[PDB]
Amino acid sequence: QNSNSIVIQQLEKFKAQDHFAGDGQLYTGVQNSALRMSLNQKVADTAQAFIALYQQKNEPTKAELLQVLANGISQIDPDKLDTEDREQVATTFESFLDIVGLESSEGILNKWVYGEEISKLLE
């Protein structure tokens, strides 16, 4: 029940961060301010969903954690972002996996990044 409060502290901090700034290296960040803010909000929404789960459940199951992840990412239309921005969203959501102790996204994150892209390529 102590781990429960820690994860929540991680999520609260994570929720308040800008996840789409330039990393100094090869990622430049989301330039459209309206879009970046809109994206941080979507991330904040998923973070807040996980918090609600841990508040109602001492030890959430892998399946529970995975559904919150899957529902959080499905809220973002991949056809509205460029490749670099989509990759940053995936990296950002990978951090959730580490936080909640979930090993995999069951291929959900890759399908999100390259799904519509490969579909349009084959079309």
Residues that bind Cl ion (CB under 5 A): 104-105
For residue 84, the minimal CB distance to Cl ion (Å) is: 19
The nearer residue to Cl ion, 36 or 111, going by C-beta atoms, is: 111
The nearer residue to Cl ion, 35 or 97, going by C-beta atoms, is: 97
- Rounded-to-10 torsion of CA 12, 18, 19, 23: -130
The kind and range of the H/E element at 11 are helix 2-15
Q: What sign does the dihedral 8-11-17-22 (CA atoms) show?
A: positive
For residue 29, the minimal CB distance to Cl ion (Å) is: 23
For residue 109, the minimal CB distance to Cl ion (Å) is: 5
